[PDB]
Amino acid sequence: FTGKFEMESEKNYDEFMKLLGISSDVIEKARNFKIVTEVQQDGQDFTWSQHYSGGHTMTNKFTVGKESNIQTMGGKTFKATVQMEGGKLVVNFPNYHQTSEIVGDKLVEVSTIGGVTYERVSKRL
Numbered sequence: 001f002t003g004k005f006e007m008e009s010e011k012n013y014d015e016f017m018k019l020l021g022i023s024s025d026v027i028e029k030a031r032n033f034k035i036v037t038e039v040q041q042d043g044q045d046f047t048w049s050q051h052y053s054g055g056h057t058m059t060n061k062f063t064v065g066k067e068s069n070i071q072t073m074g075g076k077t078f079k080a081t082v083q084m085e086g087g088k089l090v091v092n093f094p095n096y097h098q099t100s101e102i103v104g105d106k107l108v109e110v111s112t113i114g115g116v117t118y119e120r121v122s123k124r125l
């Protein structure tokens with residue numbers, strides 16, 4: 001997991017952001033943002049950073065098996081416990097399933113709400 005990763009592919013961005021309830025204008029404007037993910041793993045402990053276009057950054061620190069509060073780009077927050085399941089980090093909350101995985105030097109991040117699955121693939125730098 002440790003590294004720096006640049007977003008290159010994503011599935012179902014529009015559907016997912018609509019389901020979150022953000023405006024089409026913000027969906028359209030935000031579409032062009034570059035996203036760089038920085039991860040440092042130290043045993044069970046993770047430091048997880050997302051760097052957006054125009055200087056903004058969001059860092060989340062968590063331990064596998066321990067409870068924590070994860071935050072988003074916009075500033076929304078939610079309680080969770082990150083689990084290691086078969087090389088994936090897995091998170092759960094009310095009507096929200098999220099996974100992160102390294103697949104051949106690529107960070108693949110899947111998020112599902114209802115029947116809408118969002119995927120992000122990011123290339124290692």
Ligand SMILES: Cc1cc2nc(N)[nH]c2cc1C
Pocket residue numbers: 010013030031032033052073074
């Ligand atoms: C803030 C934000 C901007 C994005 N732009 C694209 N393409 N995907 C995104 C995801 C998030 C969370």
